[PDB]
Design an enzyme around this catalytic site. Structure first.
Site, PDB file in Angstrom:
ATOM      1  N   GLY A   1       1.286   1.954  -0.328  1.00 22.45           N
ATOM      2  CA  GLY A   1       1.384   0.541  -0.689  1.00 22.45           C
ATOM      3  C   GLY A   1       0.285   0.122  -1.645  1.00 22.45           C
ATOM      4  O   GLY A   1       0.440  -0.958  -2.240  1.00 22.45           O
TER       5      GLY A   1
ATOM      6  N   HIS B   1       6.003   5.421 -11.176  1.00 21.98           N
ATOM      7  CA  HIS B   1       6.650   6.057 -10.000  1.00 21.98           C
ATOM      8  C   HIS B   1       7.266   4.995  -9.091  1.00 21.98           C
ATOM      9  O   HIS B   1       7.998   5.382  -8.146  1.00 21.98           O
ATOM     10  CB  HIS B   1       5.715   7.044  -9.311  1.00 21.98           C
ATOM     11  CG  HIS B   1       4.622   6.410  -8.539  1.00 21.98           C
ATOM     12  ND1 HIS B   1       3.302   6.742  -8.739  1.00 21.98           N
ATOM     13  CD2 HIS B   1       4.642   5.473  -7.573  1.00 21.98           C
ATOM     14  CE1 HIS B   1       2.549   6.046  -7.910  1.00 21.98           C
ATOM     15  NE2 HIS B   1       3.336   5.259  -7.192  1.00 21.98           N
TER      16      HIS B   1
ATOM     17  N   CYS C   1      -0.812   1.708  -4.410  1.00 13.53           N
ATOM     18  CA  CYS C   1      -0.632   2.133  -5.809  1.00 13.53           C
ATOM     19  C   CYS C   1      -0.494   0.878  -6.680  1.00 13.53           C
ATOM     20  O   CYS C   1       0.035  -0.148  -6.220  1.00 13.53           O
ATOM     21  CB  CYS C   1       0.533   3.100  -5.965  1.00 13.53           C
ATOM     22  SG  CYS C   1       0.155   4.636  -5.079  1.00 13.53           S
TER      23      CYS C   1
HETATM   24  C1  T8D Z   1       1.669   4.956  -4.146  1.00 10.98           C
HETATM   25  C2  T8D Z   1       2.240   3.772  -3.389  1.00 10.98           C
HETATM   26  O1  T8D Z   1       1.500   2.923  -2.905  1.00 10.98           O
HETATM   27  N1  T8D Z   1       3.575   3.716  -3.217  1.00 10.98           N
HETATM   28  C3  T8D Z   1       4.246   2.632  -2.505  1.00 10.98           C
HETATM   29  C4  T8D Z   1       4.953   3.183  -1.298  1.00 10.98           C
HETATM   30  N2  T8D Z   1       5.891   4.231  -1.737  1.00 10.98           N
HETATM   31  S1  T8D Z   1       7.121   4.619  -0.739  1.00 10.98           S
HETATM   32  O2  T8D Z   1       7.936   5.554  -1.448  1.00 10.98           O
HETATM   33  O3  T8D Z   1       7.678   3.391  -0.264  1.00 10.98           O
HETATM   34  C5  T8D Z   1       6.441   5.434   0.633  1.00 10.98           C
HETATM   35  C6  T8D Z   1       6.109   6.766   0.697  1.00 10.98           C
HETATM   36  C7  T8D Z   1       5.322   7.043   1.844  1.00 10.98           C
HETATM   37  C8  T8D Z   1       5.302   5.957   2.712  1.00 10.98           C
HETATM   38 CL1  T8D Z   1       4.600   5.897   4.274  1.00 10.98          CL
HETATM   39  S2  T8D Z   1       6.089   4.573   2.072  1.00 10.98           S
HETATM   40  C9  T8D Z   1       5.226   5.328  -2.459  1.00 10.98           C
HETATM   41  C10 T8D Z   1       4.517   4.749  -3.654  1.00 10.98           C
END
Ligand code: T8D
Ligand code: T8D
EC number: 3.4.19.12
Lengths: 304, 304
Positions: free
Chosen positions: A143, A41, A145
């Site tokens: 952040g 993703h 993930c």
């Molecule tokens: C799951 C994860 O840690 N992710 C990194 C951050 N992104 S994003 O699309 O940059 C954001 C969505 C919500 C915020 Cl707040 S930043 C999602 C995936």
């Protein structure tokens, strides 16, 4: 003496964490040998996440679109592939800090350590269990993930989890390092509800043994039970059924304490039916179920 | 979302752990620059430990009697000195993995991570607090002495604790890295009883804020209180008095949640007087007091 929720030392995993950016999305990757593993993703625009076609999205991505940073140094991406729900980014440099490692898929009830990371940087380590509904109860902000779960056998890191998402109920879902989700979850922003979060009976029994070893004995009673009788009570209290395999796994703790497993089952039965009456066991007011029998033997014997 | 008892990543401390042997006693040392720090009781025969005169025992010890092993490699001891209850072993090699570091003496209520070690080898990491009676509730077996407690501020390890002993009640006592015991404890096998282990009120309030941020809100009530009214209730329940300094420290969590500190005090007051009624807060049936306000802000904001 004493009994703590204890994580593996995280150093061997800290040396593997990198930052992965695709477009405006930054998360964490795991760098082992010349491959960086991350959630697929990373390629999605928040818009994409509602009904993403990952094969179609991936066509628009080239090696140079995956920005991989290890500390303050950029890694060169020379290949990329999708395996289930993870990307494998081939880089031109083998991680010089790569530990001995394995990829394992764990079963519900199994515990592991999580190294929570943001922008490729370790923030904390904590102990988790794969719940019987294939969620984990983690601590993960946007952040985080690509943060990973792991066990260590002396010098070999078994990687078992990579973080991918939070359900609307604030519990967590992710994959093994082959990119296969635990449970029925999918990397899409959709209605995904968890099933019953049952208690991991065998782990509770392990922890009651830990309590006896550590001098917490007030809950030991004059009773025994049978697997079938115990299991009727377990079912009523949303505890996992206890099998002979679980009895066998508890054998070493039985032997050390001289408490027959079925006697400790009868103690647990009375605790379920009677409650704690405002008392604590190893500083807990509820029955702890995120210590495996192996965890209890490890901590009570000081394995390194 | 989610809120876990979270340790600092341990890698920077793992790189500092060594084995120290004097005679037949093996425990752990902390190698920083060209000094190895360890508990002075490494020089005692179990017989010595009943009424040891450390200055007199130390006279019988030479540099070559202190065996210091870093992984499978011996370090050469070129000097030794006693500072309070620790030995400083000067070695001929600076630890090449020495992180940025400080020695700090913490106050009761302050939390830290422990890297439990045996024979210089990391076994686990867990989170502790300096209790109001200057004990810690650790997980330490024979061989664990010289294991250290620490905090990390980005790249600087603040060492705050070295493990020295277990009281007959199975709680733990040790020193700062200047060798000064926390509390009244002494490195002698004698009658040493802990005082009242009171609850760290400010930490409980921090954790109730963590709960609100993470969607656990059932315990929020329609009441407020005053510091003086709250403190009458705290005294009755063996909670630490809350000061304006604690109210000030909770200001950022108050601001984020829009719950006045004294309102959260009134929620805590009702929980003390009414109990949990079989409910849980962040998966706990008792009020957690080993998260500082700073820990809650760190974990809720994802600092690395
Ligand atoms: C799951 C994860 O840690 N992710 C990194 C951050 N992104 S994003 O699309 O940059 C954001 C969505 C919500 C915020 Cl707040 S930043 C999602 C995936
Ligand atoms: C506090 C600690 O970890 N120590 C190392 C082990 N020694 S010892 O004297 O070798 C033993 C005493 C009890 C057992 Cl079991 S081994 C004590 C200091």
């Amino acid at each position: 003496s004493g009994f703590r929720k204890m994580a593996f030392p995280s150093g061997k995993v800290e040396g593997c964490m990198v930052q992965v950016t695709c477009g405006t999305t930054t998360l964490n990757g795991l760098w082992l040998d010349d491959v960086v593993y991350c959630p697929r993703h990373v390629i999605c625009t928040s818009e994409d996440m509602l009904n993403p076609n990952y094969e179609d999205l991936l066509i628009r991505k080239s090696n140079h679109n995956f920005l991989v940073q290890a500390g303050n140094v950029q890694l060169r991406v020379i290949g990329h592939s999708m395996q289930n729900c993870v990307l494998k980014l081939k880089v031109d440099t083998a991680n010089p800090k790569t530990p001995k490692y394995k990829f394992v898929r764990i079963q519900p009830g199994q515990t592991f350590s999580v190294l929570a990371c943001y922008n490729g940087s370790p923030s904390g380590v904590y102990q988790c269990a794969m719940r019987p509904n294939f969620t984990i109860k983690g601590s993960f902000l946007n952040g985080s993930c690509g943060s990973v779960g792991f066990n260590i056998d002396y010098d070999c890191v078994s990687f078992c989890y990579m973080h991918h998402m939070e359900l609307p109920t604030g519990v967590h879902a992710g994959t093994d390092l082959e990119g296969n989700f635990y449970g029925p979850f999918v990397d899409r922003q959709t209605a995904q509800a968890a099933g019953t979060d049952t208690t991991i009976t065998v782990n509770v029994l392990a922890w009651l043994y830990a309590a006896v070893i550590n001098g917490d004995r007030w809950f030991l009673n004059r009773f025994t039970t049978t697997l079938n009788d115990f299991n009727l009570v377990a079912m009523k209290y949303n505890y996992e059924p206890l099998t002979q395999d679980h009895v066998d796994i508890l054998g070493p703790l039985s032997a050390q304490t001289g408490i027959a497993v079925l006697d400790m089952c009868a103690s647990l039965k009375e605790l379920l039916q009677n409650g704690m009456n405002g008392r604590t066991i190893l500083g807990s007011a509820l029955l702890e179920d995120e210590f495996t029998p192996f965890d209890v033997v490890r901590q009570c014997s000081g394995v390194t």
